[PDB]
Design a protein around this motif. Structure first.
Motif, PDB file in Angstrom:
ATOM      1  N   UNK A 109       0.804  -1.222   0.000  1.00  0.00           N
ATOM      2  CA  UNK A 109       0.000   0.000   0.000  1.00  0.00           C
ATOM      3  C   UNK A 109       0.842   1.280   0.000  1.00  0.00           C
ATOM      4  N   UNK A 146      -3.153   5.030  10.899  1.00  0.00           N
ATOM      5  CA  UNK A 146      -2.342   3.858  10.573  1.00  0.00           C
ATOM      6  C   UNK A 146      -1.425   4.183   9.416  1.00  0.00           C
ATOM      7  N   UNK A 147      -0.123   4.121   9.643  1.00  0.00           N
ATOM      8  CA  UNK A 147       0.805   4.453   8.577  1.00  0.00           C
ATOM      9  C   UNK A 147       0.735   3.470   7.421  1.00  0.00           C
ATOM     10  N   UNK A 148       1.015   3.976   6.229  1.00  0.00           N
ATOM     11  CA  UNK A 148       0.972   3.176   5.017  1.00  0.00           C
ATOM     12  C   UNK A 148       2.336   2.521   4.839  1.00  0.00           C
ATOM     13  N   UNK A 149       2.374   1.486   4.008  1.00  0.00           N
ATOM     14  CA  UNK A 149       3.531   0.598   3.875  1.00  0.00           C
ATOM     15  C   UNK A 149       4.847   1.238   3.400  1.00  0.00           C
ATOM     16  N   UNK A 150       4.763   2.362   2.704  1.00  0.00           N
ATOM     17  CA  UNK A 150       5.954   2.947   2.096  1.00  0.00           C
ATOM     18  C   UNK A 150       7.048   3.177   3.126  1.00  0.00           C
ATOM     19  N   UNK A 151       8.296   2.988   2.714  1.00  0.00           N
ATOM     20  CA  UNK A 151       9.426   3.370   3.556  1.00  0.00           C
ATOM     21  C   UNK A 151      10.001   4.694   3.072  1.00  0.00           C
ATOM     22  N   UNK A 197       0.440   4.740  -1.172  1.00  0.00           N
ATOM     23  CA  UNK A 197      -0.144   6.003  -1.635  1.00  0.00           C
ATOM     24  C   UNK A 197       0.895   7.111  -1.762  1.00  0.00           C
TER      25      UNK A 197
END
Ligand SMILES: CC(=O)N[C@@H]1[C@@H](O)[C@H](O)[C@@H](CO)O[C@H]1O
Lengths: 184, 639, 84, 294
Positions: free
Chosen positions: A16, A44-49, A18
């Motif tokens: 995910x 809730x934080x999104x998956x991106x690093x 965005x």
């Protein structure tokens, strides 16, 4: 499946990513204290690093508009994969995607079994039965690049997925990015 | 002989509250007053409802609150005639009005979208006080060749001034700079625009930043232009890779690359050094009187590549000035009129070349060697000179005085201030000396009221009448009392957030003297206060302390703001901003919208009693016929 | 028999502590279904750590793991409470 | 391509038994020589540049490689960039460096080279290389516009029993005894127009005895099957070996398919072919009257 390592059965990838989110609306109805209503928000934080930049504007008919300062939040990991897909490939042309494996551990090299998952909609060294893995070593404080050459086989929206696990630790990442396939 | 004065804003506004000051000078007992506005010319009686009385209690000072509707009424300014009737006496003035409702700001989630990615946008809608109002708004989405590809019409009624919106970018469409335009349905001409780029991109995984050791290049700088290149991932971590750097010269909008300045340096431990040499820069043109290159600018493009070959990033610092002096000098925050004999407070503005305020820089005038004063954090320096009571224009020239710079490297500038032209050349003056620092709401500002006139009619003057402009409207109008023999009276000015970002102060007194002559002496002062949200807004962390969160993890967000306020959130992968950082919303961008909308066009004072009034956004019409130059120009004096 | 040695006692406490959790792992793994993907992604890696750790009969791996799994179990409870 | 040319020669060296030489040749299609340009190379799984060579190069002018890349142990260097001060618009600028396989593996993916000028990346060119694969090109099978993957194995102790097994799996959907009419070939994909002499087990293909059906195979499988015309054949596969729509259906020569040369009437009279002709015969009756045990 009993080694000092995590199993592809058990790797749940990140997917995910965005480019913008939290386009939400909250209201400071809380009990003012020293003139300052305070709201606590559960996000809730999104998956991106990456580093997220959150911008708030406030509108009050008493006090007006207000561009809050930006406020940064950095989501990261000691080890993870960067699946760098380009914008769009053309069905039936052969390219080479790169899985970049980052190791930001202080002081020890990492041994990973990284693996391009099989996708019928792509022509890769990976089959329904045979998997495609190397076993590689990343120095600490740096990056290992991992070539995977493929051939897109169906137009529309297709999906490349890589998984890796470090030995002796029980650290694992997996990314699921999608790229535009276009016909010639 | 009683005298009635009417004081209003230079330019009124539709559908908003305005205020005008009623005064009864030298009259006895209660005086009832009726005020009426009519369309011009003729009679429509657009606003008459209001009535008031000037009690001897309140020293005969009146409050006018009114709201002009927007009835069925171009290119020719529309006006109105205000009419204030004290008892039977009837004074009136003919002012300018504007259809300009207020402001509009637009926000897009990102600065840049790809074909097929939806663009979220908010239209914040407000009056001239930056308060949320509710009107109807039209909103266009122009493509990059200017052609509206979509419009809606929306009302902001009961929406607390915030209109959410979206637009789905079609799959095939021109890349290029798109625009979102919106105006109040009342006033089409005042349009508002924000842009957004549509391109094809993957996000980059680091940012690159180019930086000249100096914010400019000195032509005689044998070393050439030195530049430090810096790369770091979005997750904060230093980058290794190599980077290609290259320079050019800009003239106007015209751009010449110096093909030879191309250099390939290693980016080590997130950083790299590199230089344009004076030689390349000169060869690179044609090698002529370096002086020639003065006024033009430089630019550097760098392009980093990770050693992994995976990801590239370009970035460019543009328009670095070629200058013979580091600093610039500006008098546009200093008035252009003094009072002979009286101390003149000089507001010198000292900018770095780029445009930025330069801190701690010394300045002084032509004449006196001993006078010095630094530049507070606002690129401002307060110097005061005692002037001579000579009816001669006072030319001042200031000059930088930094140690370690040669007297040729120092920068100067000259202005010309004219004496305050009194009534009948009587030599009666008023000065407002105000201590000048960074004013902040809550802090208390002292306004020194200094009376300059022959003791002959000194006992006569009993009171000062003061006013406050702000966001081009009246924010307060009061009286400061005086006792004979006094030349100085000090005004305790509480300073609330309602003063931001800057307020104007105009004080005036009036009397009969010399030879039965009805007089008005006055003074106007600008004071730029510290700019910042009017209420507050902050978004810090929830977990007081913690380690970095992890992809997909729960995190608590903390929002500290005004009670009952509405907040609208968005979070953006900072990787976007490495592709485009332009057209973002800033509060600083809003303050900038609000100042350029000032009706007051001068830092301070007036050429005459009647200028002070038209310079700040004001008109003064009295029974005795001493009215101000009518105002019939919407914008300030074309520079 | 008599009593166990130092190592011997600690080692067998950790282990049973550990086991004590692995027992009701499956119950947990199953509550993740409703929960946001981070929970599942997490517990699965934490689960293996344990089971390998447990079988490895080495203190470190076993406690270290003891704790991993403890945490995520707690991050599940906290989760399911904001939902009834 | 067009803006750049790219000829990547992957040859073995003379004089280990695995080590070879990678040669990269580029020219710029333009009037001036390109400026600073990137060579973005990757190793074939199992290889990595000979170091003593890589230095040589970087010492060279017009060329440079970052310390950063030199310092790493050859083993840790599976991608690598070689920066260039220029590439001639006139003739080919070439170079090469011995690579060595240090790692033993089956199925070695192809390396690749990429070029471009620093300024503009979309104007790149990109050539693969590989020891066996002709062009560093994976094995695909494309007719007109539709492609499907063929990096699998060719088709692959035989008893009537071993066949009453493998020949009832899920995949099996067509079992045929067919004679081969036309043997065509091409530089890309060779085909075969075999007509069906008896429909042993019918499939999603409504084909009556006698009709002709068109099979296909990769040009790389010439050895796997000795092709003869009028030679009869036993073969079966899956209904996922079907190519394009009906009724102009085709058959795909894969792994999950099985191929065996069915002898001739008077060839079975031989005293070594009998172990086959019999197994076959039985198999025929055992699949027509009974069917699959499951
Ligand atoms: C300055 C002005 O325009 N009006 C003021 C306003 O605060 C109000 O009408 C009253 C105070 O209660 O005194 C007067």
């Amino acid at each position: 499946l009993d080694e000092d390592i995590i199993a592809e059965e058990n790797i749940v990838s990140r997917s995910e990513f965005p480019e913008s989110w939290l386009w939400n609306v909250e209201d400071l109805k809380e009990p003012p204290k020293n003139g300052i209503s305070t709201k606590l928000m559960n996000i809730f934080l999104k998956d991106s690093i990456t580093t997220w930049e959150i911008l708030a504007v406030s509108m009050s008919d008493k006090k007006g508009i207000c561009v809050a300062d930006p406020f940064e939040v950095t989501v990261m990991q000691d080890f993870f994969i960067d699946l760098r897909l380009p914008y769009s490939v053309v069905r039936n042309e052969q390219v080479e995607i790169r899985a970049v494996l980052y190791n930001y551990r202080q002081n020890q090299e990492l041994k990973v079994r990284v693996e391009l998952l099989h996708n019928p909609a792509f022509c890769s060294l990976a089959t329904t039965k045979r998997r495609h893995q190397q076993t590689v070593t990343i120095p600490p404080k740096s990056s290992l690049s991992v070539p995977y050459v493929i051939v897109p086989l169906k137009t529309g929206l297709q999906e490349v997925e890589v998984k890796a696990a470090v030995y002796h630790h029980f650290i694992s990442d997996g990314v699921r990015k999608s790229l535009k396939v276009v016909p010639e | 002989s009683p005298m009635y004065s009417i004081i209003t804003p230079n330019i009124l506004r539709l559908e908003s509250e305005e205020t005008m000051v009623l005064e009864a000078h030298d009259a006895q007992g209660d005086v009832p007053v009726t005020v009426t506005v009519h369309d011009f010319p003729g009679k429509k009686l657009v606003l008459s409802s209001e009535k008031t009385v000037l009690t001897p209690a309140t020293n005969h000072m009146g409050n006018v609150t009114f709201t002009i509707p927007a009835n069925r009424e171009k290119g020719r300014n529309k006006f109105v005639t205000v009419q204030a009737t004290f008892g039977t006496q009837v004074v009136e003035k003919v002012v300018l009005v504007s259809l300009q409702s207020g402001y509009l700001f637009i926000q897009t989630d990102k600065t840049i979208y790809t074909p097929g990615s939806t663009v979220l946008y908010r239209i914040f809608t407000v009056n001239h006080k930056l308060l949320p109002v509710g009107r109807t708004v039209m909103v266009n989405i122009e493509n990059p060749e200017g052609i509206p590809v979509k419009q809606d019409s929306l009302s902001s009624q009961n929406q607390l001034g915030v209109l959410p919106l979206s637009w789905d970018i079609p799959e095939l469409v021109n890349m290029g700079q798109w625009k979102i335009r919106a105006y109040y349905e009342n006033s089409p001409q005042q349009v508002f625009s924000t842009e957004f780029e549509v391109k094809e991109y993957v996000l980059p995984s680091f940012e690159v930043i180019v930086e000249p050791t100096e914010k400019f290049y000195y032509i005689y700088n044998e070393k050439g232009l030195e530049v430090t290149i810096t790369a770091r991932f979005l997750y904060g971590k230093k980058v290794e890779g190599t980077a290609f750097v290259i320079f050019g010269i800009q003239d106007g909008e015209q751009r010449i690359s110096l093909p030879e300045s191309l250099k390939r340096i290693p980016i080590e431990d997130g950083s790299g050094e590199v230089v344009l040499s004076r030689k390349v820069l000169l060869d690179g043109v044609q090698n002529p009187r370096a002086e020639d290159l003065v006024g033009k600018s430089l630019y550097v493009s760098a392009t980093v590549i990770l050693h992994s070959g995976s990801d590239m990033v370009q970035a460019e610092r543009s328009g670095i000035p070629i200058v013979t002096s580091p600093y610039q000098i500006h008098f546009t925050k200093t008035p252009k009129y003094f009072k002979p004999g009286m101390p003149f407070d000089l507001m010198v503005f000292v900018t770095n070349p780029d445009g930025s305020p330069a801190y701690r820089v010394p300045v002084a005038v032509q004449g006196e060697d001993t006078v010095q004063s630094l530049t507070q954090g606002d690129g401002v320096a307060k110097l005061s000179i005692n002037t001579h009571p000579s009816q001669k224009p006072l030319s001042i020239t200031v000059r930088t005085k930094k140690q370690e710079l040669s007297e040729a490297e120092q920068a100067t500038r000259t202005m010309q201030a004219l004496p305050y032209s009194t009534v009948g050349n009587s030599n009666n003056y008023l000065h407002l000396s105000v201590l000048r620092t960074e004013l902040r709401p809550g802090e208390t500002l002292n306004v020194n009221f200094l009376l300059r006139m022959d003791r002959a009619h000194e006992a006569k003057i009993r009171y000062y009448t003061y006013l406050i402009m702000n966001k081009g409207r009246l924010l307060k109008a009061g009286r400061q009392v005086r006792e004979p023999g006094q030349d100085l009276v000090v005004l305790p000015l509480s300073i609330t957030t309602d003063f931001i970002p800057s307020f104007r102060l105009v004080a005036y007194y009036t009397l009969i003297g010399a030879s039965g002559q009805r007089e008005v002496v006055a003074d106007s002062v600008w004071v730029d206060v510290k700019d910042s949200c009017v209420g507050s807004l902050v978004v810090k962390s929830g977990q007081s302390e913690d380690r970095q969160p992890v992809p997909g993890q729960q995190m608590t967000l903390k929002i500290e703001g005004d009670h009952g306020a509405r907040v609208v959130l968005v979070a953006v992968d900072k990787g976007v901003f490495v592709l485009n950082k332009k057209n973002k919303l800033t509060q600083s961008k809003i303050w900038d919208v609000v100042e350029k909308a000032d009706i007051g066009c001068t830092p301070g004072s007036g050429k005459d009693y009647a200028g002070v009034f038209s310079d700040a956004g004001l008109t003064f019409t009295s029974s005795s016929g001493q009215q101000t130059a009518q105002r019939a120009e919407l914008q300030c004096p074309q520079p | 028999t008599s009593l166990p040695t130092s190592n011997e006692y600690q080692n067998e406490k950790l282990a049973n502590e550990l086991k004590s959790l692995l027992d009701e792992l499956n119950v947990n793994e199953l509550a993740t279904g409703s929960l946001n993907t981070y929970y599942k992604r997490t517990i699965k890696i934490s689960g293996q750590k344990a089971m390998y750790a447990l079988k490895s009969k080495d203190f470190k791996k076993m406690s270290e793991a003891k704790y991993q799994l403890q945490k995520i179990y707690n991050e599940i409870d906290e989760a399911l409470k904001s939902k009834y | 391509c067009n803006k750049f040319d790219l000829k990547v020669t992957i040859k073995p060296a003379p004089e280990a038994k695995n080590t070879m030489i990678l040669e990269i040749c580029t020219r710029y299609r333009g009037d001036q020589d390109a400026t600073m340009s990137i060579l973005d190379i990757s190793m074939m799984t199992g290889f990595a540049p000979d170091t003593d060579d890589l230095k040589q190069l970087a010492n060279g002018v017009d060329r440079y490689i970052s310390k950063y890349e030199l310092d790493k142990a050859f083993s840790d260097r599976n991608t690598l960039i070689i920066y260039l001060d220029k590439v001639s618009h006139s003739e080919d600028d070439c170079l090469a460096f011995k690579v060595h396989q240090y790692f033993n593996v089956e199925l070695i993916q192809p390396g690749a080279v990429k070029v471009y000028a620093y300024y503009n990346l979309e104007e790149s060119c990109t050539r693969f290389y590989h020891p066996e694969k002709e062009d560093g090109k994976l094995n695909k099978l494309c007719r007109d516009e539709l492609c499907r993957c063929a990096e699998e194995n060719c088709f692959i102790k035989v008893t009537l029993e071993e066949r009453l097994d493998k020949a009832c799996e899920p995949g099996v959907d067509y079992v045929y005894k067919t004679r081969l009419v036309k043997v065509q070939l091409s530089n890309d994909f060779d085909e075969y127009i075999m007509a069906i002499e008896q429909t042993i087990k019918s499939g999603s293909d409504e084909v009556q005895v006698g009709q002709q059906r068109t099979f296909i195979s990769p040009i790389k499988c010439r050895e796997a099957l000795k092709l003869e015309e009028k030679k009869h054949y036993l073969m079966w596969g899956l209904s996922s070996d079907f190519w394009g729509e009906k009724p102009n259906l085709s058959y795909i020569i894969g792994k999950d398919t099985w191929v065996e040369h069915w002898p001739e009437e008077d060839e079975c009279q031989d005293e070594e072919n009998q172990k086959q002709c019999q197994d076959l015969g039985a198999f025929t009756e055992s699949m027509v009257v009974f069917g699959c045990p499951n």
